[PDB]
Amino acid sequence: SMKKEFTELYDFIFDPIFLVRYGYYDRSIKNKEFGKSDSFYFKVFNMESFADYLRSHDLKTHFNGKKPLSTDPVYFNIPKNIEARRQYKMPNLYSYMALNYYICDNKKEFIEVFIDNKFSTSKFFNQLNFDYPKTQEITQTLLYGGIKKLHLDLSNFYHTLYTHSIPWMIDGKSASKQKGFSNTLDTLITACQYDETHGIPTGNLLSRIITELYMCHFDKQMEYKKFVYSRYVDDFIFPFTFENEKQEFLNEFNLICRENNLIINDNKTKVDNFPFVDKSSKSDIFSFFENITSTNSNDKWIKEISNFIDYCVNEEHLGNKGAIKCIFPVITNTLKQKKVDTKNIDNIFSKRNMVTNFNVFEKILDLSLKDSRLTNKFLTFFENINEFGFSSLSASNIVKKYFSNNSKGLKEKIDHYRKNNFNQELYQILLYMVVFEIDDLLNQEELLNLIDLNIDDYSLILGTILYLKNSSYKLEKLLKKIDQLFINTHANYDVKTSRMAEKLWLFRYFFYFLNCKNIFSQKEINSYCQSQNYNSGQNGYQTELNWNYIKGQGKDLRANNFFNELIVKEVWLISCGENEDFKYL
Amino acid sequence: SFFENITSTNSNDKWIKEISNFIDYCVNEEHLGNKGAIKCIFPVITNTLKQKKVDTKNIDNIFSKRNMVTNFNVFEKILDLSLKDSRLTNKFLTFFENINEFGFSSLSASNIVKKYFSNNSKGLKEKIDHYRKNNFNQELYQILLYMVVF
Amino acid sequence: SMKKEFTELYDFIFDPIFLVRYGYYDRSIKNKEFGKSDSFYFKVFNMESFADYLRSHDLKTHFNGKKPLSTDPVYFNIPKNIEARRQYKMPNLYSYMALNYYICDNKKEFIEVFIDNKFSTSKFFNQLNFDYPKTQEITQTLLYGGIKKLHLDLSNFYHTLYTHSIPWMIDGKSASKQKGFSNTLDTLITACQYDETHGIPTGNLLSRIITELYMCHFDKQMEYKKFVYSRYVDDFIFPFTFENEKQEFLNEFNLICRENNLIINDNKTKVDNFPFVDKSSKSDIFSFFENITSTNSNDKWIKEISNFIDYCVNEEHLGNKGAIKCIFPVITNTLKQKKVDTKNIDNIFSKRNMVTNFNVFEKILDLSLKDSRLTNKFLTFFENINEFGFSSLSASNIVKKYFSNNSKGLKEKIDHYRKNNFNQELYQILLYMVVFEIDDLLNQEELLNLIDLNIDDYSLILGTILYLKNSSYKLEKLLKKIDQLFINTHANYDVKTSRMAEKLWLFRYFFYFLNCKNIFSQKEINSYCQSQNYNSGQNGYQTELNWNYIKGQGKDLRANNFFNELIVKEVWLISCGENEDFKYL
Amino acid sequence: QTLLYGGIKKLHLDLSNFYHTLYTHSIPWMIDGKSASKQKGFSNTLDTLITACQYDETHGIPTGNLLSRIITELYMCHFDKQMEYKKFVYSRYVDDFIFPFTFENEKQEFLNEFNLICRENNLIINDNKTKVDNFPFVDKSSKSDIF
């Protein structure tokens, strides 16, 4: 039945190993590409090694402590639109696992609410089968009987939520002015973001699960008042016929929002009158390549792909949300279904027109660079067409030519992104440079300029990879820069604070893991420490660069012990390539 | 030309999805100024099912299938569309007669309409009260006609 | 000089007795009516008695405790516009005095920042001489040299400010991840609002002073980047000539906002191009009555006043902000300057036209009822024209006739306001009923319906006054209702919580003060307690209605002792009229 | 002004071509009730005289004199009688209505009853002049500067 299928879904979801293998980076599992929320390159940043370690070792012995350790997340900033920004907070892995274990032991408090709920089309999290059109069917069924539709949307819901209002929603505000499940969940949520009570750390499955529980108690209240609507996260569609219905709904909705410190985005409040508008229809996009077959010339294929990209950008401009994100999946599916030869795939995507100087892969790459949220979409598309026959060397040469041709614009874009803390836009350029072996856009002293403050952890890792890939460069101008960065970061905390509970936890772990595997040769680190006259000790040189000294510094060493167990057992959080040489093609 | 690239060998789920998308497409077309685009929904669904040579068992499966997880039935969507504009009463009822001859059993359609009316009983009762107070003759006529027929 | 005059202003302002006599209710002192922020009727709600008590007694002996007691403020909701709402939080008097004393002892940390500041036109707080046109002159001087003006506005600045970000602004975010002035000020601010770290308690001078200090450190950062602009609270005007100037300013402004968790209201972001638009010009309003003299007939005066009200409402509609609030002051000033006889004042404002059934005072009253933020404006205007000659009995009869004529609409408005927690709209109607002796709009069981939950403290006090004014009614249907309300309110707190640190502190104090002065006869309270079978004790009947029993209940009695000292010394926070009979005309 | 008291919102309604398209036989329907008209009296004789003034044409009222305005005012005063029996308050000048209200349910109830009366009496609403004024109210027609 409905309840059995929901119970199977939530039994599969509410598993700690699942919530770290796919939960941390907000991936989707299809069996035991629209709603896909994947925002980090799986080939570099994944939790496969950590989840493999978890399957055979229980780490709950590290979270027996009463008070949750307060840690600092990775601050990653992504574009909301062409002008606005959205702030992601990637929690410390220790804090993430604490919250993960707590939610998985208290799964009963989430599942029953999710089961009883009727209004949410987002309580399935784009998992195994409950992909987008099924939630669309649920919305359709919920919208029956209404000649009018009222659209409501909370403004900055994730980023401005008062974290202490979670017990107010779950248990009642009054019962909260007086230990329990909601209070402990609140403490763990704030511990994931350094005791900050402003917002929820966004960008993973646990945050979405907690937000869905919060909004499902919202729905519980609003259905107790005998209302019916469809909600996706914080977007409400309320079907109604009579204006008194809308006014009563708005009154109760406003009371609940005001009581819970929620702000309504009044710019998105609209009423649709029947006949209803439906801008986001994908039928034309999916049927764009119906009248093209594998017997057509490769030039026809190139022209149709270019026209298709232009068509989808126009569709996105015309209000068809998500139409650009459908470009890559349906190009891949068309090439796979139409049975196009591998030599033909290579010819289509590698052909450079002698007179127009036009290459279709370069057009797709430029499209990806126009919106940084298309980074993983582009890279997945490239992996697919690489398996189809498009050689990796030709793609690398095309991307090299693009970067060389647009070097001035790319350098000033990097300067802008680094000045303005545009984290994902910088991450995309450095990720393309790492993946496609771009070894001339930035020289040595520009690469060293990215290892500084206000640079996100993933960008720092990608810059370090770019520095290590170039064997000409000397890793002492790098060790000095990294050590200075580590010292400056620790200078912002109390001296009795463990380093892995601070900012740059992921970049620190990257560096110490690389040091243990001896990509940073111990001889040259020793020479650098001697140059800086670092006092030796029982277990090293007492520098920020020495994990043996760092792992025992601080009054509270729970995160240090956690990450020491990961390092000792050779668990990597950043993939160094299939041959440990930082090559990803 | 909405159903050009669909054939009788396609799965019934594909047929249901295409009919739902087609209804949404026609409502959008009517909204965009294409006068009479909703009134073309029923005739071309009927003509498509007749031309594509879809089996009677398949007709019954398409229009009677109730999705276990989304709780979605396409006949219920068409019925709701008909109830949104009372001028579509005879269009809906003619369409139902056609698909009844095609294989969609009358008992299943009656059960679907029963479920819709039971689910939306509150809204329908207040609509009847509004229509009876305001002398909205055809809107009341449509609801009572559906009650009599089904 | 400039600095000496600013120093005199801030020496006068930063005085605890000043910050309670005018600070608490956000009043303005002219010598030792535009920007006036007065939102509560001075004749009922004032701190004259408390400030008089302070001048002769030092209450700092009550705030020697280390940990600030966390108290619950009075939640008062006022309209932001015809559709939106603004939330006021009137702090507990104990918490208010704690924060007041701390700010006055740390005045040096505010004054130097205010002195050095250049960009703020709001760091004067509409005090002695620094009224609106002088801040306009400051803005004009700051806007020199710019052919273009960029307007920026933070969205929901007071109500969504993260209170822990105050140390980030004042001391630097980095120096805050490590006792000081900023941390203690943060603790006191959160204690004023029951440890809630979401927003600043709005509606008093201390909150405006702290907000100005926060924004003056904002200005300090932005001027260190060599920018020039004019800011009023959170409204920025940035003069510029070249687009690179605007882009650089927007970049740095966005960085500071993002770092400090501040949200920009993108709907109010506009660029004015020269020639500049100036909608808010008051010259026509002030010159409306130039060609009218005291020798004109009273009918001419009535017609001109009516036309003037219509003109000002139109001006407000056309974007002339604050044009309606100028109606009452300039009518009063015109009648005073034109030397109109007192008999003529009475004739103008009391004449009821026999055929049109039109009275100008009724029109002004209806205008006041259209926007509840005009309550105090209307009541001040009525006091002025009452001194000018307009008899109080005639005004009471006119308001009686209006309320009787519109009784149905007013009753359904009261029901709407009470259901939707529209605090100021209800407060205005009950205040008009109390002031003008309206004794028939609500009967006994409707009056008792307002003494319930989700009703603000001032509305509860006004309803109690309306009940006591009617000598026919029995105060046992009132004592039962109040006791039930007190029990229900205390049921939402831990049993070891002192009652004066809870919600409804002001209404509780009102009731106990009234009981000590014997407006509630002790005999009838005793009879009610016996009817409810309340167990007696060493010091009373152990009911919520007995201050002798309540004052010693709770683990922490600092607020109880404070308010006990106020009650014992017969300090009133609600004025009972000049003759202690609740009559205010 | 006195009639518009108590309303934070104003709804403006206007009948379209009221004088020129009025069905003259609907005057007894308004004055006496439509039902009592499917069965000599004052209203019938007034209707006959009105049509005689315009050559037995039953389409409109002869416009441009005081008698036509008096009859139109009587017609609309029976309209007002019905609408006040339903406990409504508004200001009407000829066929221009200003309805003061605060809550949207008030406006919807008023529009429902107003539409029923118009439909029953063959009256057409000028939907191009239907507007809602929100406070602060607009006042374009002010003659102070001219005078």
Author numbering:
A (entry chain A), C (entry chain E): 0 to 31, 43 to 188, 192 to 598
B (entry chain F): 300 to 449
D (entry chain B): 150 to 188, 192 to 299
Pull text from the paper:
Abortive infection (Abi) is a bacterial antiphage defense strategy involving suicide of the infected cell. Some Abi pathways involve polymerases that are related to reverse transcriptases. They are unique in the way they combine the ability to synthesize DNA in a template-independent manner with protein priming. Here, we report crystal and cryo-electron microscopy structures of two Abi polymerases: AbiK and Abi-P2. Both proteins adopt a bilobal structure with an RT-like domain that comprises palm and fingers subdomains and a unique helical domain.
To test this assumption, we have prepared a Ll-AbiK variant in which Tyr44 is substituted with phenylalanine. This protein was unable to catalyze protein-primed DNA synthesis (see below), so we assumed that its structure would reveal the conformational state before nucleic acid polymerization starts. The structure of Ll-AbiK Y44F was determined at 2.7 Å resolution by cryo-EM and it is essentially identical to that of the wild-type enzyme except for a fragment of the 21–57 loop. Residues 32–42 could not be traced in the Ll-AbiK Y44F structure implying a higher mobility and/or conformational heterogeneity of this region. The fragment spanning residues 43–49, which in the wild-type Ll-AbiK–DNA adduct structure runs parallel to the nucleic acid chain, adopts a different trajectory and runs toward the DNA-binding cleft. As a result the location of the C-α of Tyr/Phe44 changes by 15 Å positioning this residue in the vicinity of the polymerase active site. This conformation very likely resembles the state in which the protein attaches the first nucleotide to the side chain of Tyr44. Nevertheless, the structure of Y44F variant reveals that a conformational change of the loop harboring the key tyrosine, which can position it for the protein priming at the active site, can be readily accommodated in the overall hexameric architecture of the enzyme. As expected, replacement of the protein-priming tyrosine with phenylalanine (Y44F) inactivated the enzyme, confirming the essential role of the hydroxyl group of Tyr44 in DNA synthesis. Similarly, cryo-EM analysis of the other inactive mutant, Y44F, showed that the majority of the particles were monomers and only a fraction of them, which was used for structure determination, corresponded to hexamers.
